[PDB]
Design a protein around this motif. Structure first.
Motif, PDB file in Angstrom:
ATOM      1  N   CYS A  58       8.987  17.047 -18.076  1.00 42.35           N
ATOM      2  CA  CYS A  58       9.117  15.993 -17.079  1.00 42.35           C
ATOM      3  C   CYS A  58       7.746  15.575 -16.549  1.00 42.35           C
ATOM      4  CB  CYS A  58      10.018  16.458 -15.931  1.00 42.35           C
ATOM      5  SG  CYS A  58      11.695  16.907 -16.437  1.00 42.35           S
ATOM      6  N   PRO A  59       7.637  14.341 -16.063  1.00 42.66           N
ATOM      7  CA  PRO A  59       6.360  13.858 -15.526  1.00 42.66           C
ATOM      8  C   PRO A  59       5.922  14.667 -14.319  1.00 42.66           C
ATOM      9  CG  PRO A  59       7.851  12.027 -15.955  1.00 42.66           C
ATOM     10  CD  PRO A  59       8.661  13.283 -16.067  1.00 42.66           C
ATOM     11  N   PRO A  60       4.630  14.643 -13.994  1.00 43.12           N
ATOM     12  CA  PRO A  60       4.206  14.905 -12.618  1.00 43.12           C
ATOM     13  C   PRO A  60       4.708  13.838 -11.655  1.00 43.12           C
ATOM     14  CG  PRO A  60       2.383  13.976 -13.830  1.00 43.12           C
ATOM     15  CD  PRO A  60       3.515  14.159 -14.827  1.00 43.12           C
ATOM     16  N   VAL A  61       4.707  14.198 -10.368  1.00 38.30           N
ATOM     17  CA  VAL A  61       5.308  13.353  -9.345  1.00 38.30           C
ATOM     18  C   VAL A  61       4.570  12.025  -9.242  1.00 38.30           C
ATOM     19  CG1 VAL A  61       6.203  15.322  -8.072  1.00 38.30           C
ATOM     20  CG2 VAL A  61       3.913  14.463  -7.571  1.00 38.30           C
ATOM     21  N   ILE A  62       5.328  10.967  -8.963  1.00 35.41           N
ATOM     22  CA  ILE A  62       4.805   9.617  -8.792  1.00 35.41           C
ATOM     23  C   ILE A  62       4.766   9.317  -7.300  1.00 35.41           C
ATOM     24  CG2 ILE A  62       5.211   7.175  -9.216  1.00 35.41           C
ATOM     25  CD1 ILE A  62       6.513   7.974 -11.868  1.00 35.41           C
ATOM     26  N   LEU A  63       3.584   8.972  -6.789  1.00 33.63           N
ATOM     27  CA  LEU A  63       3.326   8.970  -5.356  1.00 33.63           C
ATOM     28  C   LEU A  63       2.703   7.650  -4.929  1.00 33.63           C
ATOM     29  CD1 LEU A  63       1.785  12.541  -5.063  1.00 33.63           C
ATOM     30  CD2 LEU A  63       4.141  11.856  -4.529  1.00 33.63           C
ATOM     31  N   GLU A  64       3.170   7.133  -3.793  1.00 36.85           N
ATOM     32  CA  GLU A  64       2.763   5.824  -3.280  1.00 36.85           C
ATOM     33  C   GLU A  64       1.472   5.932  -2.463  1.00 36.85           C
ATOM     34  OE1 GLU A  64       5.901   3.052  -2.285  1.00 36.85           O
ATOM     35  OE2 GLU A  64       7.316   4.723  -2.137  1.00 36.85           O
ATOM     36  N   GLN A  65       0.408   6.383  -3.134  1.00 37.50           N
ATOM     37  CA  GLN A  65      -0.734   6.958  -2.428  1.00 37.50           C
ATOM     38  C   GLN A  65      -1.389   5.968  -1.468  1.00 37.50           C
ATOM     39  OE1 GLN A  65      -3.492   8.908  -5.133  1.00 37.50           O
ATOM     40  NE2 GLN A  65      -2.334  10.808  -4.853  1.00 37.50           N
ATOM     41  N   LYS A  66      -1.338   4.670  -1.776  1.00 37.39           N
ATOM     42  CA  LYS A  66      -1.788   3.667  -0.814  1.00 37.39           C
ATOM     43  C   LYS A  66      -0.952   3.692   0.461  1.00 37.39           C
ATOM     44  CE  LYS A  66      -3.990   0.277  -3.855  1.00 37.39           C
ATOM     45  NZ  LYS A  66      -4.091  -1.178  -4.155  1.00 37.39           N
ATOM     46  N   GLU A  67       0.366   3.839   0.323  1.00 38.19           N
ATOM     47  CA  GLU A  67       1.234   3.993   1.487  1.00 38.19           C
ATOM     48  C   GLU A  67       0.978   5.308   2.216  1.00 38.19           C
ATOM     49  OE1 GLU A  67       3.025   1.430   2.165  1.00 38.19           O
ATOM     50  OE2 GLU A  67       3.491   0.390   0.290  1.00 38.19           O
ATOM     51  N   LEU A  68       0.796   6.398   1.467  1.00 41.18           N
ATOM     52  CA  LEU A  68       0.562   7.708   2.067  1.00 41.18           C
ATOM     53  C   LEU A  68      -0.772   7.812   2.799  1.00 41.18           C
ATOM     54  CD1 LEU A  68       2.010  10.021  -0.703  1.00 41.18           C
ATOM     55  CD2 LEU A  68       2.796   9.877   1.658  1.00 41.18           C
ATOM     56  N   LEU A  69      -1.803   7.094   2.355  1.00 35.47           N
ATOM     57  CA  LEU A  69      -3.034   7.041   3.141  1.00 35.47           C
ATOM     58  C   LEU A  69      -2.884   6.199   4.402  1.00 35.47           C
ATOM     59  CD1 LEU A  69      -4.243   8.478   0.707  1.00 35.47           C
ATOM     60  CD2 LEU A  69      -6.168   6.884   0.792  1.00 35.47           C
ATOM     61  N   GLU A  70      -2.053   5.158   4.368  1.00 37.72           N
ATOM     62  CA  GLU A  70      -1.701   4.454   5.597  1.00 37.72           C
ATOM     63  C   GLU A  70      -0.944   5.354   6.567  1.00 37.72           C
ATOM     64  OE1 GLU A  70       0.220   0.657   5.143  1.00 37.72           O
ATOM     65  OE2 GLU A  70      -1.118   0.066   3.507  1.00 37.72           O
ATOM     66  N   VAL A  71      -0.051   6.197   6.047  1.00 39.43           N
ATOM     67  CA  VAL A  71       0.610   7.211   6.869  1.00 39.43           C
ATOM     68  C   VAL A  71      -0.396   8.197   7.456  1.00 39.43           C
ATOM     69  CG1 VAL A  71       2.245   9.118   6.831  1.00 39.43           C
ATOM     70  CG2 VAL A  71       2.800   6.980   5.659  1.00 39.43           C
ATOM     71  N   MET A  72      -1.302   8.716   6.625  1.00 40.42           N
ATOM     72  CA  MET A  72      -2.320   9.640   7.123  1.00 40.42           C
ATOM     73  C   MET A  72      -3.253   8.992   8.143  1.00 40.42           C
ATOM     74  SD  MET A  72      -3.635  12.512   4.489  1.00 40.42           S
ATOM     75  CE  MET A  72      -4.175  11.488   3.126  1.00 40.42           C
ATOM     76  N   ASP A  73      -3.575   7.710   7.970  1.00 37.13           N
ATOM     77  CA  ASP A  73      -4.373   7.020   8.980  1.00 37.13           C
ATOM     78  C   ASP A  73      -3.642   6.919  10.313  1.00 37.13           C
ATOM     79  OD1 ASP A  73      -6.410   6.739   7.180  1.00 37.13           O
ATOM     80  OD2 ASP A  73      -5.922   4.671   6.636  1.00 37.13           O
ATOM     81  N   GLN A  74      -2.356   6.572  10.285  1.00 34.98           N
ATOM     82  CA  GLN A  74      -1.565   6.544  11.511  1.00 34.98           C
ATOM     83  C   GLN A  74      -1.504   7.899  12.206  1.00 34.98           C
ATOM     84  OE1 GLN A  74       2.278   4.813  10.630  1.00 34.98           O
ATOM     85  NE2 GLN A  74       1.336   2.899   9.934  1.00 34.98           N
ATOM     86  N   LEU A  75      -1.517   8.998  11.447  1.00 31.40           N
ATOM     87  CA  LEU A  75      -1.620  10.317  12.067  1.00 31.40           C
ATOM     88  C   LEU A  75      -3.013  10.583  12.629  1.00 31.40           C
ATOM     89  CD1 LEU A  75       0.428  12.459   9.513  1.00 31.40           C
ATOM     90  CD2 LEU A  75       1.121  11.765  11.792  1.00 31.40           C
TER      91      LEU A  75
END
Lengths: 772, 772
Positions: free
Chosen positions: A295-312
């Protein structure tokens, strides 16, 4: 078909917004429940359904029915402030297009709208009971048209529970008296699938609809060894891991990956905070290892996740070191050590699906709703005890993302010695709900009954023993037992012997004192009110005004295990402590001859004077934390000096702000007008955690302490100034603290341009309302 | 001629009102004084004329000149609050039709308009100096266009005298410094006929005009035995009494009757309050006996005097038993024991001429304008001392009703042994005014000079020794001496050693501390500020919040001989005094053993230990009086319990309300934010004498404590509700609390209907200005 809402004929405003939410069709069970009979005509109602079942849509349509047709007002009662906030914002969006007016009474918050203006009040049980006591005082009760209760199963299980019983029985007692001696006040109750829900409906004189319909089928199971057993303990699968996990043997890590590859979320409940951190770390490192080895490695919305990390990262506490590595991989932990905004961002990212494994302590289960496909519960043991069946069903009840999943799944992980408990959780069922008022015969009588008898007598209902026995018959204790009247007579004797009420000859008639009326108006517990009143009289005879500490000593709640008090820190702090604060200490009775003893070792604490002295010490230590907190010492620095966690400080801060309100209203009703001056500032000042400087500017709800700090430091010292400021100025000053990295609890993240505009427009709105 | 104001070309709105006041033509000396030269073009002016000359008309026309053409603002500085109130209402009545905006700053009064919204500020000297200190802090001084000073002769001698020199020197120093390195600020100074008026004009760089022109010729003579002697001691007349007397031998009653044989009125000055009561009583008995035995007896129009008595009896003080008999016969007494409203009503009735003989202590002679036709003065020896020549010339200066009389007369009554002193007063003249800044032998430095150096350094002018010497050259002490510089360097050393200022290397530059900035901003004395600051720290470390007494102990002015303290009352009160109040006593340092000593016999304090010990006792006793006054205990009951007269309580009440303002602003600048909360309410509560709840309502200026009490008791708890009120309801309430029987200080007496309408209209006006 009578299932497309257009057939019902709702206001087009709510119809279109429901279509934007997705409720184009109601389920058959919801249609029947509204049709069921006198329900639609105003009879009381109780219903239970799975949390996924569209539970609240029935109550929402009944609110519209009452509020539009009757034009009377409704209460919505909710178990927790986090739920209460979320429901307030949901209802505002839908009803504000109608023009129906919604605001809430939650925690230490009060609405800017006075209740005369409101149509719907969303409130926590504690503030709901306080409101009804005021509605009795004003005799406003005719204004209410509906009272909706969520989590009616709380009725037996907590201090919040008895308040819900004392709340509902006053409405029953008053309304039925006024009716007997169409239904004016309608109750709609929502609950867990209790065994004795038939009784609760019969006590309330409700109509009842019980269903276990779910929009997505639920598959339960238990895993022990490699074997996965269905709830009937037949084998449904034997597990073998797709992922050769190194971290731990229960396969909890590889059992998550099994569904992550199907593009669906996992939610994972852990016995404790540090376990949740350690397990979220391991899962993220195995995600990284797979990606680094790939199976693939996980597919991640990393642009969205950095926006989440910025909000934190822009939060006052920043980004936690454990979150820093885990969040970009898409794993997160959620526990009582996170701050409220930090949890809310993690929750919000999980609903969208940017986070795909969320580990949590059980507090997430009873709180805000999240849909998750695979819910894994690591052990039948939590905190060194068997897991409660209510908590398990609140956990697994989340499984299956409605309309997205074809089925939901849950795996209780279990060991061989624990397997008997794992089976018991699958096949067992909740206890019948049970009034907390049942006499604990080691006391004189339970404090919830003493409160109950106080609330009627001081309220000015049931001033006489025959009426107190008539209110007793409304009490759910009566319907559950159907000793109570002997317990009531003991409560009257206790209240009378402790001067909360006066006895007079006419039978007899009982009158409130000032102490009684202050207890009822404050909503303090009366046994606590003796020591509050004794400590206030001891302080007013020798107060220290040169600092904030002595006021905070009276405001701080008593010690309630809210943290482990590190005595070594406390004795180290004590030597450094200013002599001015040491004067506050020796006035209230702190003594270093005992504080040295606690750092030397454990105090035996088996005698009442050592108990009260220890409570004096522990109350003092807690008051130092609040003094640093209202001087805007950052949460990170309090944690260095005292050692408690961010979430312990914030939960202490919220409860202390409630207690500051109680003490203010208590002192006002007694007439200690000097004390009312000092203490009234502290409710708001503790709630937001600010200096006296900021208390006016923080009135704009879009401003937290830090945003108010920068607007203040820029010179906008008042709401008039903030309304005069140009939006471009606020933007620069907010940036001085083109992407969404401002968090506002009622909204998704704002841009600085959008926030600044709404800040200025809210300041103009506030002035219009304030001048009017 | 063109002495008609229409030829000068004033605005018609003031011209028509001057015609309504009879000022159709200005005197030749007034025309010259405005013409005199650069006076009309903005040069400073000092001028001197008799009090009965048109003295203020010159200043009034110069105000119009500046405020209409420059549109800059003016100050009007006046020696007493009673004058300042009278002058404010005159100027409002005259100017408000032009649209010019007038308000004032007087004791604890503060205008509803901020200073930027005024054109003219009418100020007591003490509040005027406080304003200029704020104008330096803001650097607003450019806003001023004129500063008018009355009673420049106060500059020499008063304890509020030097404060006018510190005021004038700062305006001179700043204006000359900024102008040297048209006249922006113009001084206009009204003055007595001082010997060295030419020096004062030269110091102020002023033009000068001096005249002794009077509108009615003055006759002035001394009476000894039956002989009336002119100033040259030639016999003017032999005296034989037209009306035989029994009360006293000096014919004083017969000497009044000679003019009471005509429509004219006598004003009679007496050396003591109780002497004034006894002499006014005797005169009223002999008037009654003449009427009862019956030149014509008196004609009194007693319908008018019953309206006067009804306006008195409505007052909280009621009608004094001595006034009760004397007033209907047209005789009245006026002394510092009367309530302020009693004095105002007695003064007003004498102006109309309803009262025909008014007897007064000296305070009336300096205080307020009354026309009197014959002025009689009863000894050269007031209080056991010869009269001050200033006082005598103020008493005689009133003689002769402008335009009514052909001549005015004054008689001084004098015995054989006194005669040399009586002639000495009659022939003598005033002392030259002097700075009151020179230190005496054995002084280090004068408190006025310490204040002078404090005000500049903390103000931020003359931060350096060369500039302090330059400000010294502006000081009137320099013009009078033309040692001062040695006394300045000692003042700088005293301030620096008492931490009011910090010294730093650049010469040297001196900086304020927080204590310096607080003592300047409060306008306290710095020597007093040491003990104020020490007492505030000692109280804030052990305060009593359960009552108002400890707050009042800090707020009460230090004992200033305002009463003879009856120690026997004080010890009788002390045994009764509640144990809570005795705790306040033990904290502040009162000792019952010393209090029993003062009852046991006269205690004379021989040492600083006994001086402050006694001052603690005397300050405590005074604080109890303020506590009963703040409870709204009627002035009559305070007089019963403590002994002191109405006027002593009210003058204590006004001065304590000023001091409550000083300590509030002092605590703000230090940053004792808790003390701000407690003390700030007390300034308003002391000013009006009210419980806490009334503090919102009394800000409608037509409403006193008793009128606020009845409106509050009815339910108009807020100014919004008073603006909502139906006028007929206020009428019924005030009638419940037909004729003109309400008293309002800015008006004649009002009907119940007229007051009620204006009360409601003021409440609406308050809302309009408050919302805007």
């Amino acid at each position: 078909d009578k299932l497309l809402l257009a057939n019902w004929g709702l206001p087009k405003a709510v119809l279109e917004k429901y279509h934007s939410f997705g409720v184009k069709k109601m389920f058959e069970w919801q249609a029947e429940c509204l049709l069921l009979g006198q329900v639609l005509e105003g009879k009381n109602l109780v219903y239970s359904a799975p949390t996924s079942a569209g539970k609240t849509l029935v109550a929402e349509l009944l609110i519209l029915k009452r509020v539009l047709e009757m034009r009377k007002k409704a209460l919505f009662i909710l178990p927790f402030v986090s739920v209460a906030k979320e429901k307030k914002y949901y209802l505002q969006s839908l009803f504000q297009e109608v023009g129906i007016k919604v605001d809430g009474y939650m925690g230490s918050t009060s609405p800017s709208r006075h209740f005369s203006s409101l149509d719907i009040a969303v409130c926590t049980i504690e503030r709901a009971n306080g409101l009804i006591n005021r509605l009795i005082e004003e005799n406003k009760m005719d204004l209410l048209g509906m009272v909706v209760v969520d989590e009616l199963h709380m009725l037996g299980d907590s201090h919040r529970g008895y308040l819900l019983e004392l709340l509902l029985t006053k409405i029953c007692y008053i309304t039925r008296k006024s009716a007997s001696c169409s239904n004016a006040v309608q109750i709609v109750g929502m609950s867990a699938t209790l065994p004795n829900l038939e009784l609760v409906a019969s006590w309330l004189n409700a109509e009842l609809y019980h269903t276990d319909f779910r929009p997505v089928p639920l598959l339960e199971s238990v895993k022990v060894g490699n074997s996965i057993y269905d709830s009937s303990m037949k084998l449904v699968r034997e597990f073998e891991p797709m992922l050769q996990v190194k971290g731990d043997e229960d396969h909890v890590v590889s059992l998550c990956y099994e569904t992550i590859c199907d593009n669906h979320s996992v939610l994972l409940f852990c016995p404790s905070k540090k376990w949740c951190e350690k397990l979220a770390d391991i899962i993220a490192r195995e995600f990284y290892n797979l990606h680094h080895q790939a199976c693939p490695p996980v597919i991640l919305e990393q642009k969205e996740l950095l926006e989440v990390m910025d909000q934190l990262r822009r939060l006052p506490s920043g980004l936690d070191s454990v979150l820093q590595k885990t969040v970009p991989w898409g794993v997160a932990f959620h526990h009582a050590g996170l701050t409220f905004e930090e949890r809310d961002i993690i929750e919000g990212a999980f609903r969208q699906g940017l986070i795909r494994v969320l580990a949590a302590t059980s507090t997430l289960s009873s709180g805000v709703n999240l849909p998750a496909r695979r819910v894994i519960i690591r052990t039948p043991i939590f905190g060194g005890r068997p897991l409660d069946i209510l908590t398990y069903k609140q956990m697994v009840g989340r499984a299956g993302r409605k309309g997205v999943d074809t089925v939901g799944e849950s795996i209780l992980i279990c060991k061989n010695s624990e397997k008997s408990k794992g089976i018991a959780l699958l096949q067992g069922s909740l206890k019948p709900v049970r009034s907390c008022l049942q006499r604990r015969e080691g006391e004189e009588v339970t404090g919830s009954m003493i409160r109950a008898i106080l609330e009627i007598i001081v309220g000015g209902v049931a001033s006489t023993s025959q009426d107190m026995h008539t209110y007793a018959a409304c009490t759910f204790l009566a319907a559950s037992m159907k000793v109570q009247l002997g317990a009531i007579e003991a409560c009257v004797m206790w209240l009378l012997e402790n001067e909360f009420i006066q006895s007079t000859e006419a039978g007899k008639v009982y009158h409130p004192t000032h102490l009684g009326s202050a207890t009822l108006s404050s909503s303090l517990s009366p046994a606590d009110t003796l020591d509050i009143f004794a400590d206030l009289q001891r302080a007013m005879k020798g107060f220290v005004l040169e600092n904030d500490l002595h006021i905070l000593y009276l405001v701080t709640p008593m010690f309630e295990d809210w943290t482990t008090i590190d005595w070594y820190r406390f004795f180290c702090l004590w030597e450094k402590l200013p002599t001015s604060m040491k004067r506050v200490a020796e006035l209230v009775g702190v003594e270093e001859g005992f504080l040295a003893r606690c750092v030397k070792g454990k105090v035996v604490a088996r005698t009442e004077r050592q108990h009260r002295q220890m409570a004096i010490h522990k109350r003092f230590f807690t008051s130092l934390v609040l003094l640093d907190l209202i001087s805007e010492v950052p949460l990170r620095e309090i944690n260095q000096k005292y050692g408690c966690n961010r979430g312990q400080i914030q939960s202490l801060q919220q409860s202390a702000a409630v207690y500051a309100g109680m003490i203010t209203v208590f002192s006002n009703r007694l007439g200690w007008h000097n004390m009312e001056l000092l203490l009234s500032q502290f409710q708001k000042r503790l709630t937001f955690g600010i200096q006296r400087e900021l208390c006016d500017l923080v009135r704009v709800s879009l401003l937290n302490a830090q945003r108010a700090r920068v607007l203040y430091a820029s010179g906008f010292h008042t709401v008039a100034d903030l309304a005069r400021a140009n939006i471009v100025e606020v933007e620069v000053i907010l940036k001085n603290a083109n992407m969404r990295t401002i968090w506002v609890t009622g909204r998704k993240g704002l841009t600085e341009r959008e926030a600044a505009a709404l800040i200025v427009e809210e300041a103009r709105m506030i002035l219009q309302q304030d001048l009017v």
